[PDB]
Scaffold this active site. Structure first.
Site, short mmCIF file in Angstrom:
data_model
loop_
_atom_site.label_atom_id
_atom_site.label_comp_id
_atom_site.label_asym_id
_atom_site.label_seq_id
_atom_site.Cartn_x
_atom_site.Cartn_y
_atom_site.Cartn_z
N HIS A 1 0.84 -1.20 0.00
CA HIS A 1 0.00 0.00 0.00
C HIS A 1 0.87 1.25 0.00
O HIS A 1 0.72 2.13 0.85
CB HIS A 1 -0.95 0.01 1.21
N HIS B 1 -12.14 -6.35 2.73
CA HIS B 1 -12.07 -4.96 3.18
C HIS B 1 -12.47 -3.98 2.07
O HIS B 1 -12.47 -2.77 2.27
CB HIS B 1 -10.67 -4.63 3.69
N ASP C 1 -2.79 -7.06 -6.18
CA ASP C 1 -1.98 -8.19 -5.76
C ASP C 1 -2.69 -9.53 -5.95
O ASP C 1 -2.10 -10.59 -5.78
CB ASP C 1 -1.56 -8.03 -4.29
N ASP D 1 -8.47 -12.15 1.24
CA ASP D 1 -7.73 -11.36 2.22
C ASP D 1 -8.04 -11.78 3.65
O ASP D 1 -7.17 -11.74 4.52
CB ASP D 1 -8.02 -9.87 2.04
N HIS E 1 -3.24 -14.61 1.03
CA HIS E 1 -1.93 -14.26 1.58
C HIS E 1 -1.52 -15.20 2.70
O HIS E 1 -2.28 -15.43 3.64
CB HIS E 1 -1.92 -12.82 2.10
N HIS F 1 -11.57 -10.65 -5.30
CA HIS F 1 -11.04 -9.36 -4.90
C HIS F 1 -10.15 -8.81 -6.00
O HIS F 1 -9.28 -9.52 -6.50
CB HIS F 1 -10.27 -9.50 -3.58
N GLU G 1 -7.98 -6.18 -6.04
CA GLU G 1 -6.79 -5.40 -5.71
C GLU G 1 -5.62 -5.96 -6.50
O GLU G 1 -5.58 -7.16 -6.80
CB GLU G 1 -6.51 -5.42 -4.21
N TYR H 1 -1.60 -7.69 10.58
CA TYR H 1 -2.47 -7.51 9.42
C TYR H 1 -3.81 -6.88 9.80
O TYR H 1 -4.22 -5.88 9.22
CB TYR H 1 -2.69 -8.85 8.72
C1 LIG Z 1 -6.05 0.34 2.55
C2 LIG Z 1 -6.95 0.99 1.54
C3 LIG Z 1 -7.98 1.82 1.96
C4 LIG Z 1 -8.82 2.41 1.02
N1 LIG Z 1 -9.84 3.23 1.45
C5 LIG Z 1 -10.68 3.83 0.53
C6 LIG Z 1 -11.70 4.65 0.96
O1 LIG Z 1 -11.86 4.85 2.17
N2 LIG Z 1 -12.55 5.25 0.05
C7 LIG Z 1 -12.36 5.03 -1.30
O2 LIG Z 1 -13.12 5.57 -2.11
N3 LIG Z 1 -11.34 4.20 -1.74
C8 LIG Z 1 -10.50 3.60 -0.83
N4 LIG Z 1 -9.47 2.78 -1.26
C9 LIG Z 1 -9.27 2.53 -2.73
C10 LIG Z 1 -8.25 3.49 -3.32
O3 LIG Z 1 -8.64 4.82 -3.07
C11 LIG Z 1 -8.11 3.26 -4.82
O4 LIG Z 1 -7.46 2.03 -5.03
C12 LIG Z 1 -7.33 4.38 -5.51
O5 LIG Z 1 -7.80 4.52 -6.83
C13 LIG Z 1 -5.84 4.07 -5.54
O6 LIG Z 1 -5.09 5.26 -5.41
P1 LIG Z 1 -3.49 5.23 -5.62
O7 LIG Z 1 -3.14 4.04 -6.48
O8 LIG Z 1 -3.05 6.49 -6.34
O9 LIG Z 1 -2.80 5.11 -4.29
C14 LIG Z 1 -8.64 2.18 -0.33
C15 LIG Z 1 -7.60 1.35 -0.75
C16 LIG Z 1 -6.76 0.76 0.18
C17 LIG Z 1 -5.65 -0.14 -0.29
FE LIG Z 2 -6.84 -6.38 -0.57
FE LIG Z 3 -4.34 -8.67 -0.55
KR LIG Z 4 -10.47 -9.03 4.72
O LIG Z 5 -5.44 -7.42 -1.62
#
Ligand SMILES: Cc1cc2nc3c(=O)[nH]c(=O)nc-3n(C[C@H](O)[C@H](O)[C@H](O)COP(=O)(O)O)c2cc1C
Ligand SMILES: [Fe+3]
Ligand SMILES: [Fe+3]
Ligand SMILES: [Kr]
Ligand SMILES: [O]
Ligand SMILES: Cc1cc2nc3c(=O)[nH]c(=O)nc-3n(C[C@H](O)[C@H](O)[C@H](O)COP(=O)(O)O)c2cc1C
Ligand SMILES: [Fe+3]
Ligand SMILES: [Fe+3]
Ligand SMILES: [Kr]
Ligand SMILES: [Kr]
Ligand SMILES: [Kr]
Ligand SMILES: [Kr]
Ligand SMILES: [Kr]
Ligand SMILES: [O]
Lengths: 400, 400
Positions: free
Chosen positions: B22, B146, B82, B165, B226, B78, B80, B193
């Protein structure tokens, strides 16, 4: 020791290794020095000391230059630990030696050392101290430059101004004088110093310099507490201070951000391109705050006419490093600068508005924000490029 | 590949080198893994992928296990980077392959990959997918656990829960199963975590686990995305999640601070002593945020009943690292915890009240602040010791 001029001897300490100042808030990439000065006329006067970790070497080197009992007066321009840290060690050998300083300095010296039994002598602007041979020390109070206790000591005849922190820089070199060192490296450290430390006190810089110039006292040398001694056109650093104080800015835009998956980074690069292809006069710097020198960022903000700050939305708030940096900028109080917040989000977002508000709290004149969802595609990258165009046109110093 | 159970094959990727997740917000001190699973019955099903930088190796290793054309279904729990980072690389070879995921996953997958032409199949809780031999996949939506797109896939017969996750941890090891690794190192990464990631979603954890248990489906193994596969008493991580969700706290106090000249540090050590000599049941940890692991600090806050945060007054505001960390805590939303702000100042101060307010904004129940001027002498250190005493008595879980 090194002969500064006639009977003025540099008895300070060079610090080649030091990389952290004020905790870890100021990175000293080229080390620093702690300049102490011993004036030997009819009276023997010591001006400031060194950092506490070099106190053992300081006293010993001082013994090799003069018997400690032969020291008549001690001048403390500033009671920060890097200039008055070796005070307790020295006063243990010569407790009866008078200390000349400001009224606020008694509070700061005692605050660190806890020896109020020392013989303090409150000095104010205009007060003199005769040292013999037609020479004397003239004291000038400089409150909040950068501390309440800050002052400067002027030596008549030799025309040497002991400015302590003022006009100084963290730059370590075997040679003492400004005309003996690398001019570029010297300028970088001087500008880095002011931007990170003296920026919030800029409103006080100009009237103080104007007041000192009103004294009509000649200045052959400026002996600071950090870095080189200005002997070759010494007032050149004074002129730089006058320019830097007047809400200094160049035709320059600083972009910095923090990202978790490079989405915001993609936005920053697209914004930068839009600016460069809209205003060729603008110098553009880009920094990831997680991977860059924080002070180098702040130095660019100081030189910039405006900044763009990026953050991804993380747990309904912004990324900590961004929040931390903005907090510090709120203390630095940059003036006559503009700003625009941007960043990527996943769903609801909220960190960009949160950031834009805090930038406004920091004193930046806020332009419209730029928001994007997830990773920007070709269409989204156009909007980011267009945002840069609108910023470049809004912040243009001259028409085009 | 490694045989998980019967026809379930682990085709993921170990990451021994990774130290940052992150951005730089999660330090992975023991590396991590990206678990992908290939189920081969009458139908061939791929569950999740790996990080994008390992996409080349992922596809190649997948070719060595099965012909890509023989893959019937692809499940994305998911999106994300990863877990779905190698998706574009894979879909380039097999574009017609159906992708099973949540409705929110279509937005997230397309948001990163920009290939909406892919064949998505919206699944919701209760939906099934037959793969032959009397076995089937059962989908369960877990929004905001999450991510909005988060879900889990359950395989009947083999009784294997693919939790992505959930119940996972960043811990790299050659052995795949939980009973084959170091239990202590495994627990640390599991708690690290949850504390840094899943804390703000704790209110959702318990009802979701209760709902899943309502399905009365047997669980022989829990295959996360993970770390290790839970096969030996797999529900042990579920029980830990139930405890950690209920506003978890031990009889423990976490003190962290940032300092420029060690004055605030002296205060923190004096506070800690007062607590220890008042309540012997309290475990006390101390961290300089400029010199410590940020996630280790946050893990302790999660385990603690209350925290004391220190900051020196710098340019009328607090130190940036402290402000940054507090901002992050505002997002983590710790519950049923108390706090007290402290710190040293030079003259007017103001950073301690500023900090106490933001801690309250972060959800901490605020006790009285402790302030000291410059470096604390013996008398001042008594007040700091007494402050710790008052805190220890106020925050005492049981009488004494
Ligand atoms: C730990 C974590 C918390 C996040 N919290 C929010 C959130 O509260 N609200 C939201 O709209 N997106 C949230 N996101 C999604 C990110 O805002 C989204 O992936 C963003 O486009 C990535 O920005 P970046 O790659 O420039 O860091 C979260 C992502 C992560 C990994
Ligand atoms: Fe994730
Ligand atoms: Fe993950
Ligand atoms: Kr989770
Ligand atoms: O993830
Ligand atoms: C760069 C800098 C800025 C400061 N700003 C303030 C200030 O705005 N108000 C104040 O009362 N003291 C200020 N001080 C003085 C410190 O608060 C004082 O030295 C404090 O006791 C040291 O705290 P610490 O050693 O725990 O970091 C400042 C000191 C420095 C070095
Ligand atoms: Fe200073
Ligand atoms: Fe200094
Ligand atoms: Kr200064
Ligand atoms: Kr000045
Ligand atoms: Kr001056
Ligand atoms: Kr969960
Ligand atoms: Kr569960
Ligand atoms: O200083």
């Amino acid at each position: 020791s090194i002969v500064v001029k006639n009977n003025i001897h540099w008895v300070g300490q060079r610090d080649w290794e030091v990389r952290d100042f004020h905790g870890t808030e100021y990175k000293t990439l080229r080390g620093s020095s702690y300049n102490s000065y011993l004036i030997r006329e009819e009276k023997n006067v010591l001006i400031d000391t060194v950092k506490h970790k070099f106190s053992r070497e300081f006293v010993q080197n001082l013994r090799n230059e003069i018997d400690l009992a032969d020291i008549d007066y001690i001048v403390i321009n500033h009671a920060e630990e890097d200039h008055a840290g070796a005070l307790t060690e020295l006063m243990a050998q010569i407790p009866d030696t008078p200390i000349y300083c400001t009224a606020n300095a008694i509070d700061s010296i005692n605050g660190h050392h806890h020896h109020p039994e020392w013989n303090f002598n409150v000095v104010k602007t205009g007060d003199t101290l005769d040292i013999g041979n037609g020479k004397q020390l003239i004291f000038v109070e400089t409150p909040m430059l950068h501390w309440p206790d800050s002052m400067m000591t002027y030596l008549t005849g030799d025309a040497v101004l002991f400015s302590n922190d003022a006009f100084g820089q963290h730059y370590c070199d075997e040679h003492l004088f400004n005309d003996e060192v690398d001019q570029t490296e010297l300028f970088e450290q001087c500008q880095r110093y002011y931007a990170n430390i003296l920026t919030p006190f800029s409103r006080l810089v100009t009237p103080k310099i104007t007041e000192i110039l009103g004294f009509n006292l000649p200045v052959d040398m400026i002996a600071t507490s950090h870095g080189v001694v200005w002997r070759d056109n010494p007032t050149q650093i004074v002129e730089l201070y006058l320019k830097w104080a007047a809400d200094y800015q160049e035709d320059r835009i600083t972009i910095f951000y923090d990202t978790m998956s490079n989405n915001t980074r993609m936005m920053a690069d697209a914004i930068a391109q839009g600016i460069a292809e809209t205003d060729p006069r603008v110098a553009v710097k880009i920094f990831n705050v997680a991977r860059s020198d924080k002070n180098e960022i702040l130095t660019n903000v100081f030189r910039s006419k405006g900044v763009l700050v990026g953050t991804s939305t993380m747990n309904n708030v912004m990324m900590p490093k961004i929040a931390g940096l903005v907090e510090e900028m709120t203390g630095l109080r940059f003036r006559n600068k503009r700003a625009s917040a941007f960043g990527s989000h996943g769903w609801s977002g909220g960190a960009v508005d949160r950031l834009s508000t805090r930038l406004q709290d920091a004193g930046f004149e806020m332009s419209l924000s730029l928001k994007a969802k997830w990773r920007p595609d070709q269409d989204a990258l156009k909007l980011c490029r267009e945002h840069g165009r609108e910023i470049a046109r809004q912040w243009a110093l001259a028409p085009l």
